[PDB]
Design a protein around this motif. Structure first.
Motif, PDB file in Angstrom:
ATOM      1  N   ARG B  18      69.619  39.764  34.811  1.00  0.00           N
ATOM      2  CA  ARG B  18      70.883  40.379  34.406  1.00  0.00           C
ATOM      3  C   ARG B  18      72.113  39.463  34.480  1.00  0.00           C
ATOM      4  O   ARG B  18      73.133  39.757  33.851  1.00  0.00           O
ATOM      5  N   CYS B  19      72.041  38.376  35.251  1.00  0.00           N
ATOM      6  CA  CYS B  19      73.242  37.557  35.479  1.00  0.00           C
ATOM      7  C   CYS B  19      73.093  36.076  35.152  1.00  0.00           C
ATOM      8  O   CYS B  19      74.047  35.441  34.693  1.00  0.00           O
ATOM      9  N   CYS B  22      74.525  33.883  32.289  1.00  0.00           N
ATOM     10  CA  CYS B  22      75.931  33.484  32.237  1.00  0.00           C
ATOM     11  C   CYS B  22      76.465  32.842  33.509  1.00  0.00           C
ATOM     12  O   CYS B  22      77.595  32.350  33.515  1.00  0.00           O
ATOM     13  N   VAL B  33      78.734  30.476  30.303  1.00  0.00           N
ATOM     14  CA  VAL B  33      79.650  31.435  29.703  1.00  0.00           C
ATOM     15  C   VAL B  33      80.562  31.993  30.803  1.00  0.00           C
ATOM     16  O   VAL B  33      81.765  32.202  30.589  1.00  0.00           O
ATOM     17  N   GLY B  34      79.985  32.194  31.986  1.00  0.00           N
ATOM     18  CA  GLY B  34      80.731  32.652  33.145  1.00  0.00           C
ATOM     19  C   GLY B  34      80.851  31.579  34.204  1.00  0.00           C
ATOM     20  O   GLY B  34      80.163  30.548  34.144  1.00  0.00           O
ATOM     21  N   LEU B  37      79.266  30.797  40.727  1.00  0.00           N
ATOM     22  CA  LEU B  37      79.645  31.800  41.710  1.00  0.00           C
ATOM     23  C   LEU B  37      79.522  31.327  43.156  1.00  0.00           C
ATOM     24  O   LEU B  37      79.642  32.139  44.073  1.00  0.00           O
ATOM     25  N   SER B  45      89.648  36.425  43.039  1.00  0.00           N
ATOM     26  CA  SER B  45      89.139  36.393  41.670  1.00  0.00           C
ATOM     27  C   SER B  45      89.935  35.416  40.816  1.00  0.00           C
ATOM     28  O   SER B  45      91.136  35.236  41.012  1.00  0.00           O
ATOM     29  N   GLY B  46      89.252  34.768  39.881  1.00  0.00           N
ATOM     30  CA  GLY B  46      89.921  33.892  38.937  1.00  0.00           C
ATOM     31  C   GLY B  46      90.404  32.554  39.439  1.00  0.00           C
ATOM     32  O   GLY B  46      91.325  31.979  38.864  1.00  0.00           O
ATOM     33  N   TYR B  51      87.213  26.468  35.686  1.00  0.00           N
ATOM     34  CA  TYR B  51      86.852  27.536  34.764  1.00  0.00           C
ATOM     35  C   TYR B  51      88.086  28.233  34.179  1.00  0.00           C
ATOM     36  O   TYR B  51      89.030  28.545  34.902  1.00  0.00           O
ATOM     37  N   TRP B  64      87.124  38.967  46.795  1.00  0.00           N
ATOM     38  CA  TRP B  64      85.781  39.518  46.588  1.00  0.00           C
ATOM     39  C   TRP B  64      85.055  39.777  47.899  1.00  0.00           C
ATOM     40  O   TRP B  64      84.963  38.894  48.760  1.00  0.00           O
ATOM     41  N   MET B  69      82.879  44.224  44.990  1.00  0.00           N
ATOM     42  CA  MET B  69      81.875  43.661  44.091  1.00  0.00           C
ATOM     43  C   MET B  69      81.041  44.797  43.518  1.00  0.00           C
ATOM     44  O   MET B  69      80.750  44.838  42.326  1.00  0.00           O
ATOM     45  N   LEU B  73      80.635  45.644  39.593  1.00  0.00           N
ATOM     46  CA  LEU B  73      79.382  45.520  38.852  1.00  0.00           C
ATOM     47  C   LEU B  73      78.902  46.840  38.262  1.00  0.00           C
ATOM     48  O   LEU B  73      78.062  46.856  37.355  1.00  0.00           O
ATOM     49  N   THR B  83      88.833  41.966  31.101  1.00  0.00           N
ATOM     50  CA  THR B  83      87.900  40.893  31.452  1.00  0.00           C
ATOM     51  C   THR B  83      86.978  40.558  30.268  1.00  0.00           C
ATOM     52  O   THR B  83      86.651  41.423  29.447  1.00  0.00           O
ATOM     53  N   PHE B  87      79.298  42.648  30.160  1.00  0.00           N
ATOM     54  CA  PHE B  87      78.201  43.181  30.952  1.00  0.00           C
ATOM     55  C   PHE B  87      78.483  44.648  31.166  1.00  0.00           C
ATOM     56  O   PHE B  87      79.533  45.013  31.699  1.00  0.00           O
ATOM     57  N   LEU B  99      71.157  43.398  44.564  1.00  0.00           N
ATOM     58  CA  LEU B  99      71.772  42.236  43.924  1.00  0.00           C
ATOM     59  C   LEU B  99      72.810  41.582  44.843  1.00  0.00           C
ATOM     60  O   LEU B  99      72.824  40.360  45.030  1.00  0.00           O
ATOM     61  N   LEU B 103      73.104  37.953  46.374  1.00  0.00           N
ATOM     62  CA  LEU B 103      74.219  37.122  45.950  1.00  0.00           C
ATOM     63  C   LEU B 103      75.015  36.593  47.139  1.00  0.00           C
ATOM     64  O   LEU B 103      75.423  35.443  47.131  1.00  0.00           O
TER      65      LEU B 103
HETATM   66  C1  HEC Z   1      77.718  36.861  30.122  1.00  0.00           C
HETATM   67  C2  HEC Z   1      77.179  37.546  29.094  1.00  0.00           C
HETATM   68  C3  HEC Z   1      77.771  37.446  31.565  1.00  0.00           C
HETATM   69  C4  HEC Z   1      76.884  38.207  32.228  1.00  0.00           C
HETATM   70  C5  HEC Z   1      75.496  38.680  31.748  1.00  0.00           C
HETATM   71  C6  HEC Z   1      77.400  38.479  33.556  1.00  0.00           C
HETATM   72  N1  HEC Z   1      78.654  37.901  33.641  1.00  0.00           N
HETATM   73 FE1  HEC Z   1      79.813  37.772  35.308  1.00  0.00          FE
HETATM   74  N2  HEC Z   1      81.290  36.893  34.210  1.00  0.00           N
HETATM   75  C7  HEC Z   1      81.155  36.462  32.888  1.00  0.00           C
HETATM   76  C8  HEC Z   1      82.402  35.928  32.427  1.00  0.00           C
HETATM   77  C9  HEC Z   1      82.679  35.377  31.024  1.00  0.00           C
HETATM   78  C10 HEC Z   1      83.352  36.032  33.607  1.00  0.00           C
HETATM   79  C11 HEC Z   1      84.840  35.625  33.635  1.00  0.00           C
HETATM   80  C12 HEC Z   1      85.552  36.917  33.207  1.00  0.00           C
HETATM   81  C13 HEC Z   1      87.036  36.759  32.985  1.00  0.00           C
HETATM   82  O1  HEC Z   1      87.685  37.793  32.681  1.00  0.00           O
HETATM   83  O2  HEC Z   1      87.579  35.632  33.129  1.00  0.00           O
HETATM   84  C14 HEC Z   1      82.572  36.635  34.667  1.00  0.00           C
HETATM   85  C15 HEC Z   1      83.043  36.927  35.919  1.00  0.00           C
HETATM   86  C16 HEC Z   1      82.285  37.322  36.984  1.00  0.00           C
HETATM   87  C17 HEC Z   1      82.759  37.455  38.336  1.00  0.00           C
HETATM   88  C18 HEC Z   1      84.187  37.147  38.834  1.00  0.00           C
HETATM   89  C19 HEC Z   1      84.214  35.650  39.131  1.00  0.00           C
HETATM   90  C20 HEC Z   1      85.533  35.151  39.691  1.00  0.00           C
HETATM   91  O3  HEC Z   1      86.479  35.962  39.826  1.00  0.00           O
HETATM   92  O4  HEC Z   1      85.606  33.929  39.996  1.00  0.00           O
HETATM   93  C21 HEC Z   1      81.724  37.850  39.089  1.00  0.00           C
HETATM   94  C22 HEC Z   1      81.759  38.121  40.601  1.00  0.00           C
HETATM   95  C23 HEC Z   1      80.560  38.000  38.243  1.00  0.00           C
HETATM   96  N3  HEC Z   1      80.937  37.657  36.957  1.00  0.00           N
HETATM   97  C24 HEC Z   1      79.301  38.375  38.644  1.00  0.00           C
HETATM   98  C25 HEC Z   1      78.284  38.732  37.778  1.00  0.00           C
HETATM   99  C26 HEC Z   1      77.003  39.276  38.152  1.00  0.00           C
HETATM  100  C27 HEC Z   1      76.617  39.489  39.622  1.00  0.00           C
HETATM  101  C28 HEC Z   1      76.286  39.488  37.037  1.00  0.00           C
HETATM  102  C29 HEC Z   1      74.890  40.129  36.922  1.00  0.00           C
HETATM  103  C30 HEC Z   1      74.820  41.418  37.322  1.00  0.00           C
HETATM  104  C31 HEC Z   1      77.111  39.124  35.899  1.00  0.00           C
HETATM  105  N4  HEC Z   1      78.307  38.639  36.401  1.00  0.00           N
HETATM  106  C32 HEC Z   1      76.776  39.206  34.563  1.00  0.00           C
HETATM  107  C33 HEC Z   1      80.028  36.547  32.114  1.00  0.00           C
HETATM  108  C34 HEC Z   1      78.901  37.251  32.447  1.00  0.00           C
END
Ligand code: HEC
Ligand code: HEC
Ligand SMILES: [Cl-]
Ligand SMILES: [Cl-]
Lengths: 108, 108
Positions: B18-19, B22, B33-34, B37, B45-46, B51, B64, B69, B73, B83, B87, B99, B103
Motif C-alpha cells: 500500500r505504501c 511511493c 513520488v512521496g 519517511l 509534517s512537510g 522534498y 507526527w 498518523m 491514514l 495534500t 491514497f 502498519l 512504520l
Molecule cells: C503515492 C501514490 C503514495 C502512496 C501510495 C502513499 N503516499 Fe504517503 N505521500 C505521498 C505524497 C506525494 C506525499 C506528500 C504529500 C504532500 O501534500 O506534500 C505523502 C506524504 C506522506 C506522509 C507525510 C510525510 C511528511 O509530512 O513528511 C506520510 C506520513 C505518508 N505519506 C505515509 C504514507 C503511508 C504510511 C502510506 C501507505 C499506507 C502512504 N503514505 C501511501 C504519496 C503516497
C-alpha cells in the motif's frame, strides 16, 4: 497528539477560566454560545442534541477521543477549518492533559 | 484516533502493498513520488530535507505520532485537504495499527 493522564483539579480550573463562558458539562445542562458537552467522548462531532452547529463541525464527523481532543484544543480552527468556536487554543501540553482529564470525568 | 500496538509483521506486508510504491523508509532512502519517511515520528509534517511538499502539508505542521498518523491514514485528504498524496486510506483500524507498528520501527 498523545494524551497522558493529568490533574483533574488543575483541569477543572482551566475549564472554569477558559471554557465555561461558552460551555456547560453536566447531563441535561444548557447550550450557551457553544454546545453542552455531556457525552462528548465516544460520540461523533456535531451531535449535541438540539444545538445548531456549523457545517464544518458537522462535516468533520470525528469520533472524539482523548488524543484528537488534545489536537483540537491546541488549535481549533486548524483542526476544524470553518469552525465558529472562538477559542485560540491551549498551547501547553500539560494544560491540555489536565483539561482533558477533567473533561473526561465531568462529561461522563 | 487511539493507536494500539499490533503486528509489525503484518504491517510490513501492508507497507509493501500500500505504501512502498511511493515511499521508502530507510535512513538515506530516496524520495520517490512521496518523501522518504525515515525519522517521520517526531518530525513536523512537510519538513523532510530535499522534498517538495504541498503548502497544505507544510501548513498542517503536525508533529507526527502514532495517533494523528492513524487519523491521517484513514483518509489523508480529509485530514490534510490539499495534500497531493493520492491514497484513499486504510479504513480498518487493525490495518492502521499493524502498519503504524511496523512504520514506527522501520523509520527509526
Ligand atoms: C503515492 C501514490 C503514495 C502512496 C501510495 C502513499 N503516499 Fe504517503 N505521500 C505521498 C505524497 C506525494 C506525499 C506528500 C504529500 C504532500 O501534500 O506534500 C505523502 C506524504 C506522506 C506522509 C507525510 C510525510 C511528511 O509530512 O513528511 C506520510 C506520513 C505518508 N505519506 C505515509 C504514507 C503511508 C504510511 C502510506 C501507505 C499506507 C502512504 N503514505 C501511501 C504519496 C503516497
Ligand atoms: C466561546 C467563545 C467558546 C469557548 C471559549 C470555547 N468554546 Fe468550544 N465551542 C464553541 C462553539 C460556538 C462550538 C461549536 C462550533 C461550531 O463550529 O459549530 C464549540 C465546539 C466545541 C467542541 C466540539 C463539540 C462537538 O463536536 O459536538 C468541543 C469539544 C469544545 N467546543 C470544547 C471546548 C473546550 C474544552 C473549551 C475550553 C478549553 C472551549 N471549547 C472553549 C464555543 C466556545
Ligand atoms: Cl526503504
Ligand atoms: Cl482499506
Amino acid at each position: 497528539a498523545e494524551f497522558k493522564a493529568g490533574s483533574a483539579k488543575k483541569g477543572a480550573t482551566l475549564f472554569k477560566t477558559r471554557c465555561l463562558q461558552c460551555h456547560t458539562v453536566e447531563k441535561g445542562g444548557p447550550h450557551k454560545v457553544g454546545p453542552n458537552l455531556h457525552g462528548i467522548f465516544g460520540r461523533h462531532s456535531g451531535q449535541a442534541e438540539g444545538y445548531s452547529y456549523t457545517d464544518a463541525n458537522i462535516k468533520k464527523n470525528v469520533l472524539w477521543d482523548e488524543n484528537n481532543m488534545s489536537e483540537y484544543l491546541t488549535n481549533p480552527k486548524k483542526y476544524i477549518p470553518g469552525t465558529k468556536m472562538a477559542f485560540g487554543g491551549l498551547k501547553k501540553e500539560k494544560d491540555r492533559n489536565d483539561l482533558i482529564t477533567y473533561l473526561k470525568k465531568a462529561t461522563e
